[PDB]
Every structure is written in structure tokens, then in C-alpha cells.
Design a protein around this ligand. Structure first.
Ligand SMILES: [Mg+2]
Ligand SMILES: [Mg+2]
Ligand SMILES: [Mg+2]
Ligand SMILES: [Mg+2]
Ligand SMILES: [Mg+2]
Ligand SMILES: [Mg+2]
Lengths: 235, 235, 235, 235, 235, 235
């Protein structure tokens, strides 16, 4: 896997998954997508949105930044296209404010959909006012420098998950999940299948049908040894 | 206290406190109720609401779930009545997503007012959209299984407090407090007494009367040895 | 520095910075102000707002409180004037609910703009409803007592920063920064200079000019050894 | 369960489990005992020993202390007998130094075997020098007061587990587990059964027999769909 | 990078780095090795040794385990050879006790040098008594199950670093660093070069030569603007 | 208080407290010293020793270092004299490895007694082997740079306490406390007074006299309303 942690390199061309597929994954959401690919790819639950009610997806443009150093953000902007999501990880843990409204302005100018950053962000009310969506480990006004080289479009570890450039990142109020570029098709189909099933179940549950009956659980619960008593005094 | 931690049991009948009393406690709020019962019963401050501005109370239907296992949620739904609050604790610490919008749909169909869960929840924007109130230790899309039996309506430890089935749980933006079923009356009266006093004080404070004068503090402060100086250079 | 940690003292007269200067710092915000004074004065990123979208500043009226003891809040109210911000630190770490809506009512009656507290707060929905802005380490309904003396208008350590009475505290969604009273002028000018520059840059970035070109970064990046490759297979 | 959180009460007489049974549980250790009672009773993994290599058990003498208040420690000492373990929890979370070498001296004079405290301890090198074993949430020299009443020999929540007076607490380098007084016999027998089995297995494993063969796992692994490949390039 | 997170697979044959090289890296230690490869490869500082004074290295045999499930440990033992270090990560965060003295006995029988586990361990005093070295995220007696398949000798993320099977893991009291199998030679040479330089410097420093003079820092410090004053009153 | 956070300055001459007084404070220990000065000056309980059984004190030589930058350590060494303790804080939170065995060698050559660092340290087994005592926030092999100027012998905030150069820092297994240089005499006398009293009490407690009788607590406990019952069934 070789190129992880390597600095001083910008890879220009990456293979992206396709806009329509990406858009659909965003609408299905993180929980459904995660489940659809057999519960893999979920980033640390410490990666949190700075806004409420936004669910989206995009193709990962990856960035490795030195600790306390945001030099590679401007380098990465040039490599972004509409539909991309910038995915940034520091080379060692850091919660400084790597990113704010100026970089967000530049990203929006390129049609970038969001930032996922395994570090801190600032100018957060301005980011919300601009409608630029961010998932971050911290909110921190502490600034960074521009001294040490990192990389753009090499694989990175972000929130405990490997992210390859061009992988699809899906992000919503619950968290962030990565979908492998080559698995995008299978994951989308599986997630939609799950979504269809859940909608039928939701209607049945809303009508007052019990899940125990819907999912046919009662016999298996009894076989495991579930016992009902009328009153706690019976025990 | 015996039955804590016991699995494979569902107690059907629990004695509930009464709807009007429960409703009043919800309106008075967590801080006032906690103070009214001599500062006992408060759950861990890590139990946080996923929404803002909701204050409520209900009769606890308790659930013990195995770690990473939400099997007992559907079992518990059947035992819930309008006005109940589902109170769930894992048998060992876990922040996986035990609960989302499908289970919330089922609970709302029974008139359940909220979930208090000493673990993770997901589908959180959908939960907010549905207006289903939740207090949780974590937001986490990571799913659970249905393999190991737990219990319903046995006592549980949730957020560091013992919760008996039928105890009253009061929850708001500040946190969650448990009121013992047999102490509901005394706590309600004490909380209302506090509320009446605080409203008079609030009016006096808003008018610009100082608490030092209102609460008659000045003489006791002087006796403890509080000393005023005009300028810091005097010291 | 002597008087830090000393109890039983209230200093009545403090030299304040000036309202217009304070107001301007509030509008410029924490990140800009922090950067303007060479990245000093930022309080712990664990000091968080209980509301969204409020940015302000005021002259610090400082309070040292004993652990689990809010006695000095009422003592401090009397020493506050319009434009002040109450800045409170416990003498040892504590996240109990030191402050709620009654004290907030009293502070608003004096024209106090906010509370910064290195501990817990409660009645938080009421605080939001009143529009009383708070930055706190915790939300916690657990009450306090009034037994042990602290101090008012002596220097305190709050969020890892020394705060002298009359220093300017600037607070927004990103955090809280302290500006030394005697450095208020230089910091304001520097922050406004930064703000002017950033607004021009923002317009250029929004137009689609790259920061690499704007900030003249490309030659220095090449000199550090940044290398572009077309495809990841080239490596 | 009623009496939890109640203050101002000392229960003099408690039913204890028996010394020999208690001693055996200590020798078997926390992991084995926990497993023997179907993985219940384990206190928070944040409860840690201040020493290395000590494993023991005793009958719980329980103490509820007010936050930052160790008044009840001296009250509790009088109620202790040889073989007891003092189990202390604050009425709300606190990591102050509740306990040090003087109280330890008094406990040792009564033949008390250890302290389990859901808070802080100090004088820790002296405690080690005396050979007084302690499990604590924190090491903290910050002192406490003696102003507010708590209780002795009422049930408490300690490390997230209910502890009744006279329950058996087993503590070692891995943590602390509570064994219900009335379940002491069954747990001891089950723990010894486990210990016997594990010793035979250990000898087989040391000889180089694989667990896959010992525990007869291979057929079930294949049935679940475990697939072997020679080289990673095969995938 | 594809195979990360995949379950149900055991890769039998992995290319290992060489024993002598591995042994030398262990003697040089984590800090020196980390620095030698330009400060990459360091695992989370939360990965801590359960013993003091042991420094070692080995070839990684990687294991992905389901959360709360240690089934793959016994599967992995069979694939281990003398000199290997078992490197284990759960498919989602978990601090349960995955590993204790029985598995350690089996690993020692195969000549395995250590375990690195991004989760919990138990039987820790027995592990120390056996001299089986472990780096873990937690000490936790809470047991696991054997229900869900994982993988052996596929790449894993452990402590925030990608570990490929056959990579070299170096572990000591300061932490754990991964050295890429194909970079073993360059890293060893660089680490030894650093070690030689540091030993000469250490001798000079012990003799009382100042680093400012040794490393020729004084002129560069002055050029950056470092200013000496005799007394603090001069400022 | 002005000079806090200022960079680019080295103050050469500081007034030190006196060796014998400092040595005595070290022998009395942190808890006793902290109590003697009315429970002030204690650093964060997160500042922990990397060794066991060492208690000491020294005159603070203070260092402000930039984040991830240890340049000022070598600058500070030159300003140290026998008996000094180096006290280091980063200008913003950082847990990188600022310090290891080379710097420790240089400090020992000057007769420096210890390091207190509000950040990370490495080479920790070597530090123990050398007998160089350290209190740190973290153990972390991640290296630092030498690019940004800090200060030496200006006041710093370390572990949440203001430390002036020449203040006395006392450090042991329980933590670290700062004693103001001008209060050294009063604190030493008060700490020795406490120590004398505690030794008499210890002898009485060891003999089996109860603290309730020794400290004359029984009447005050009864007056507060402490009630004894024989059996828990009485309630
Ligand atoms: Mg900005
Ligand atoms: Mg769902
Ligand atoms: Mg209130
Ligand atoms: Mg003591
Ligand atoms: Mg075991
Ligand atoms: Mg070193």
C-alpha cells in the first residue's frame, strides 16, 4: 500500500466515480450505505458535522497535511472539480484550525461539496452562513503555518479509515462513511434495496404492527429462552 | 436488589406513576426537579439530547441490551403504553447505533414520548424530523445484531443511576433525572414550591434588586471574612 | 503575579477598556483577533457556546469560585456595569451547574453581555430564550452550595489563559480569546488590517483566482520540492 | 430499590459472605469470576489499581459521600471488620483526593483489605509503601471537606454497578467485579470450574496444540464461510 | 487498496522481512526508528504497553476481528512463526478484553514476540508473569464471543496506521511504529545513522557542552530575533 | 501580568528561593504542601510522573515553546543551575514528544532535578534508566521542529497554574504543586506543622483510636442529623 504517509507529491489525475451514483448515495445516507456494504467504511464517530440537516456525497480529493500546517489546502483546491469532497488528514494528530471561510470560498468556487477534516476548523458561523458543509474533529480558532510539504491525491487515513482518491465519501448528521470507488455500484444497489425494504417496514410499524411479528422474531426468542412473567414479584 | 443484570426475562406488568404528575414534572424541568429531591437522581452529564428545546417526562419502561445487540428494543415496544419513556442500558459500555427511525416509528405508534439510551443512536435527522425526542451517549451509525437476550422491565443502571421500571424520568436540554415512583408526589410538590419561589425572585432580580439583598447574604459574607478594597493596588 | 488563587477579596474599581473598541473586536471575531495578536490568548477549545450565531466582546469582571460553590456570582453581579462580561473559574476543576437563568436575569439587569465559565451551566434553554450568551465547559444540572469564599476582580486562570479584570474577552462560535487591556488598541488595529486584507482575498477567491497565485506560493512550493505527477501509477 | 442516594444514615449490621469463599474468589481473579457469573458485575474499566500484582476480595462496606466531602470515611471505619473492603461513591462525579495514608492507617488497624473508590486518592506512594491496596478513578492531591452528611451501608452505584453492603468485591490488575452476596456460592463454584478447565487447556496450548483443534472450531469456521488462500495475490 | 475491511479470508503465505534486521530495529527503539523514516508510521499514543522496560520488533501477522469477537485469534495463531508479532484491530472501535493468558500461552508456543491490539486485554498480571509483551488500548476484563468471521493477513488499520502483513512493527515504552516491509533496509540504516550521531552528542552533552554550541544554533536564533535581557524588570 | 505569551525573550537573572527550603518542601510532598497553602497551586491531575517513588522540588526555570517546537529547550539549559526544575508549556495544546534522553543528559550535566512539561515526552525508559524525573501530559514519540521562537524565564501557564520563574515546584507521585517564591517560608512552616500533626494522628490511628474520637466529630455529626440504625430493614 506503499504511498501512504509520503510527502511532496501531487497526483493530478484520479479516476472518479460517477455523479449520479454519488448523488444517490448522499440521499440514502450514512447508516443505510454503511449497512449496505456489510458495516464497513465508517469513520470515527468523533468526526462531526458543524451544521444540522445536510446529507451529501462526493468523490474524495485527498490531502495529507503536516501537523499545524495547512499549506496543502491551496495546492489541493486546484485539483478539485465540481462534485468533489476534500478529505484531509494531518500526518500526526492535530486539532488546530486548518480551515475557515477563505478556503471554503475557494472550494465553493470550484463546486466542491464539503470538507471532511481529521482536525480542527474555524470561522464556523461564516461557513454555515455560506452553506459550506464540514465534518471535523474539533472547532478551534488556533491558526496553522505553511512550512512543511504534504501530499494531494495519495491515499490517507482519515477518522480511522483508509481513503483512496476517487473513493466516495458519504456524510450526514450521523457521521461519514467511505465507499470504495470500485464497489460504488454494488453498494448503491444494496443501499437502495435496504431503503425500499425499510420504507415498507416503516409503514407497517406506523400502522402499529409489531416488529416481533413483522420480522418473525417470537419463535427464535422463545428458543433462546426468553421468558415472560406478569409481575416482578413472580421472580 | 438481586434482579439487576439478569437476562432472558420480560416483566409485563409494572406500576406506573400517574400521567398528570408526570406531565407537570416535565414542565418544571430537570434542574428544578433534581434540586427538589435534594440533588439526587441526576444521570451522567454525558447523556445528551439530539434535539434542542424539548422538555418532557414519562414512566420508565426499562431495557437491558447485550453489547452491540438491540434485540430487546422490539420486545420492549410491545410492553409500552402512551406516556412511557423507553430507558435502555447495555450490559457493558457500548456506543454503537442501537436505535434509529424505524424503532422510533414503532414507539411513536404506541405513544411513547422519548428514548433515554446509555449508548449510541443513528438516523438522527430523521428522528428530529419525526419529532421523536432522544437522549443518548453518542451519535453513531455503526449497526447492532440480534443474537443475545437481554431483559425488559427489570431494574437497570443507566447514566450511573439505578432506574426501576415505572420510575419517572424527566429529560430536557440540561440532562436527565430519575424520580422514584414512590417519591413522585413529594418531588412534584417540592419542585413546584421551588418554581414558585424562583419566579418571585426572578421578577425581583429583573427589577434590579441584588441577590445579596434578596437572599440576605451580606452579613454572612462579612462574618466569613469577605473584604472589599477599592483598587487592586491596595493589596 | 501574587494575587492569583487568593480568596475573600473583592476589588471594586477596575480599569476598563473602552466600549467602542470592545464592540469592534466582537464584530471582527475570535479567529481574526487571535491571529492579530500573533496567535496568543486563545482559551481552551473545550470552552463552548451554548448558542449558535452570537459573536461579542466585553470587559472582564473576574470571579474565582470554590469548587461546587457559586457564592461569588451574586457578589460579582454588584460589581458589573453595562458592557462587562463575567469570567468565572473554579479554584479546582469542576463541571457542576454554577449558573442558570436567575443569575442570568440579574446579569441582564446590569447590562452584562455574557458569561464565560470554566465549569458547568444549567437552565440552558431558558438562557437561550432570554438571549443570554454563555460559553461553558459543560452543561450540568447538578447544583452548587454557598459556603466558601472566593474572589472578585482578581486575576484568574480560565480555559488555560490568565484573565486580568478589565481585559477584553472576545467570544463567538469558534471559542474565546483574551485581549490584554493595554494591548486593546494594537490588537484592534491589527485585526481590522487582517479583516480588510481577507475581504479583498475572499472576493478574488470567489471569482476563481487560486490562492497559489494570489499568495505567490508556487515558486516556494517548487523550491521545497513539491512534485506533480499525472497518474498515481507514475510513482 | 428505594434507599439509594439517601443521606444521613448509618446501617450498623450487614450480612457478610464468608471469609473462605471470599478469599478463594480473590485468588481466582476478576476475569474468571466475571465470566463465571455470565459476564455481569464488572465495574468501569476506569477504576484502576494504584499498585501492580495485588489480587484480593472482601465484603463490601459501602459509603456514599457528598461531592468533595470525605466526612463519611471516618464514620465508615468504625463499621468495618477484618476482611471488609471499603467501597465508596460520591453522590455526583468527583475526582478530588478523598483518601490518603491516614485513613488507610485506620483501615489497616481494623483489618480492612482495600479501598474501591469512584473518585480520587492521594498519598499514593505512602499507600504503596504501607501495602494498602486501592482501586480509584483518579490520583489527585486536591483535598476534601467535612460538611455534608452521606451514608454508610446503604446500596451505592460505584463504577456503574450497584453494590449492596455485604456483596463481595473482587479486585485485581484488570479491574473490579461485584458478586452478589446470595450468589457467592454459585459464582465461586462456576469460577473454580472455569479455572480447572483453563489450566488443562493452558497445558495443551503450551505443548503446542492449537485452539482450533482443542475447542473443535474448524468445522464451524468452514460452515460460516472462512476461506483460506495461499497468497494475497490470489484475491 | 481494496482488501481492507474484508472478512472471511485467511492469507497463509506472507513475505516477511528478515530476523536480524527486525531484531536491530527493536534495539534502536520507536523514537529513533520513527525519526529515521521522516516521522511516519507512528501508532496512536493511546496504544500503551502493559509492561515496563521491553523494546522489541517483529513481522506483523495481521488480524481483523469483529467487535466484541475474538474468534480470529485462534485462527491467526496457526499462521504465526517465531519472530512474528500479532497485530489486531476490531472492525469498529471496541475496548473489550479480546486477549488473555491462554492465547498468550499459544502465541509463546509458536515463538510470537508480542501482541499489538487496538482494543482491550485482560489477565494482565499473568501476561507480565509469563513475560508476554502487549501493547493495548485498554485493560478490560469484559469477555468476547466467537460468532462473526474476520480475517487474517489482510491489511488492517491499527492505532490509525495501515499495517500490511509482513510489515515490521517496533514497540517499546514510548509506543509503536510500523516500518514498511520494502523500506526496512533504508529505515534500519537511517536509524543506525541517527543512533551513532546521538551517542556522540550525548557524550558531549554529558561533558557539559551546550547544544546551542554543538548544533550551531546561536546565530540562527539571533537572526530570528531572540533577545536576551538580564532582568525581567528590563521589559 | 503583561509578559505571559510573549516570545523571543530570554530573561537571564531570576531570583530563586533557597536550596534548603526547596529540599524540605520536596520531602513533605505535594498533598501536604498543597494543603498548607490553603489548597491552591495544584497543577492539572493530567500532569503525571513517568516514574514511581520520586518526590522532589526545585526552582522553576520557565519555558514557553511554540506548538510542536522544542527549540527553546537548548536555550533554557544554559540558564539552568543546580537545583532548578525546568517547567515547560507550549503556546497552544500539544502532546508531541518535546523532550527525551539527550536533553535530559544536558539538564543532568547542569544539576537540574526534573522536568515538568505540559506536553509529551519520549525516550522514557532511558529517562528512567538515567534517573531523570519527569512529569508530563503524554508519552509520545512524535518529534518536534526548531523553527519558531518562544521564551525562557517569563511567566507561563502550565497545567492550569501560573508559574513565575523562581517559584518553587514540588512534584511527586500524586502530582505537582507550585509555591510562590515570596510565600515559600510561610508554606514550608505550615506544611511542617501539618506533617507534625499528621504523624501524631497516624500513630493514634495505627493504635486503633477512631478518627471520630480523635478529631471530636461525633457531636457535630449528630447535630447535622446523622442517624444510626441496626439493620437496613429498620428503614
Ligand atoms: Mg479564516
Ligand atoms: Mg435505521
Ligand atoms: Mg436555575
Ligand atoms: Mg493524607
Ligand atoms: Mg483468560
Ligand atoms: Mg531522543
Amino acid at each position: 500500500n506503499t504511498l501512504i504517509g509520503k510527502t511532496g507529491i501531487v497526483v493530478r489525475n484520479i479516476q472518479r466515480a460517477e455523479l449520479d451514483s454519488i448523488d444517490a448515495l448522499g440521499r440514502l445516507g450514512v447508516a443505510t450505505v454503511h449497512e449496505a456494504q456489510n458495516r464497513k467504511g465508517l469513520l470515527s464517530s468523533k468526526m462531526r458535522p458543524i451544521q444540522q440537516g445536510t446529507s451529501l456525497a462526493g468523490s474524495a480529493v485527498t490531502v495529507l497535511v503536516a501537523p499545524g500546517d495547512n499549506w496543502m489546502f491551496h495546492v489541493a483546491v486546484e485539483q478539485c472539480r465540481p462534485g468533489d469532497v476534500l478529505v484531509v488528514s494531518p500526518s500526526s494528530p492535530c486539532t488546530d484550525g486548518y480551515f475557515g471561510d477563505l478556503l471554503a470560498t475557494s472550494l465553493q468556487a470550484r463546486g466542491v461539496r464539503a470538507l471532511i477534516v481529521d482536525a480542527g476548523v474555524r470561522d464556523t458561523q461564516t461557513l454555515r452562513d455560506m452553506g459550506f458543509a464540514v465534518w471535523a474533529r474539533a472547532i478551534n480558532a488556533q491558526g496553522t503555518v505553511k512550512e512543511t510539504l504534504g501530499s494531494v491525491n495519495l491515499p490517507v487515513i482519515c477518522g480511522g479509515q483508509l481513503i483512496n482518491p476517487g473513493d466516495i465519501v458519504v456524510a450526514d448528521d450521523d457521521g461519514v462513511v467511505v465507499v470504495r470507488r470500485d464497489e460504488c455500484e454494488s453498494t448503491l444497489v444494496a443501499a437502495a434495496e435496504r431503503a425500499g425494504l425499510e420504507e415498507e417496514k416503516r409503514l407497517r410499524l406506523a400502522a402499529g404492527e409489531l416488529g416481533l411479528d413483522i420480522y418473525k422474531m417470537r419463535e427464535r426468542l422463545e428458543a433462546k429462552g426468553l421468558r415472560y412473567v406478569d409481575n416482578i414479584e413472580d421472580l
